[PDB]
Design a protein around this ligand. Sequence first.
Ligand SMILES: [Zn+2]
Ligand SMILES: [Zn+2]
Ligand SMILES: [Zn+2]
Ligand SMILES: [Zn+2]
Lengths: 11, 11, 129, 129
Amino acid sequence: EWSFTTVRKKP
Amino acid sequence: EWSFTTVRKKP
Amino acid sequence: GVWKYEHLRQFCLELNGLAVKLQSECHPDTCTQMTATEQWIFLCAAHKTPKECPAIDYTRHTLDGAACLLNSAKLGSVCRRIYRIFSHAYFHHRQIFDEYENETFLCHRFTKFVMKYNLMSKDNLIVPI
Amino acid sequence: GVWKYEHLRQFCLELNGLAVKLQSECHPDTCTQMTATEQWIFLCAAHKTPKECPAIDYTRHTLDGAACLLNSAKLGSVCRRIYRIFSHAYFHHRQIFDEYENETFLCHRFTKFVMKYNLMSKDNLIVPI
Ligand SMILES: [Zn+2]
Ligand SMILES: [Zn+2]
Ligand SMILES: [Zn+2]
Ligand SMILES: [Zn+2]
């Protein structure tokens, strides 16, 4: 569905 | 801001 | 990039087969929430605010939302949510999961695909093979 | 419940004091992203799609969004995002953080408040005292 991701883990 | 949380951790 | 949206659509079609098999015993009086194994509840995103849908509802609404998004980073979200259908079946409907997987290898094929195109974090791939 | 929105507003006011102190050395050529300690980047929510704002921008836009939401579960999200202003300052601007905290105890007061009203998971409370 819709998305709103505010945390990303660095590669 | 706006929120859209789809995972909740049980107490 | 076009093949990413494309191959996902075939997965959603066969995933409907799994959902239909599940609806024979995944009922909202016993699977009252969408869970897999730990103390996480998953909230269905097919609503204005994420909703505690029973597992059968989560499954249907999410497949429906994915089918709609496709015929029209967003890929990652769909994949993450679709994958929970496999994990719920694997942990709470093991016999049905096993029967369906032995015939289709769908979870295997889906797992290889999201890893091949870096669409989910490997941390979320909790179903074996 | 009304006191929850209320006490948060005073926190946002004093948190502006911290943000103003930080903008003297938290610049987008060196703090190019919003981070605290681990391998997480935080994406600013004051945009149509979450954006990789430099830390100074993340700070301003988030305080601005919180001030706007207040004069008009949503509390939990604001608190989680506001808290990152403290963690960024603590880990990347330790001297400024320490000076401001010794005068205001703001992070202490904020931490007790979100725990008192169960507004953040304790797992996210990574700044000591
Ligand atoms: Zn079930
Ligand atoms: Zn639903
Ligand atoms: Zn900075
Ligand atoms: Zn921003």
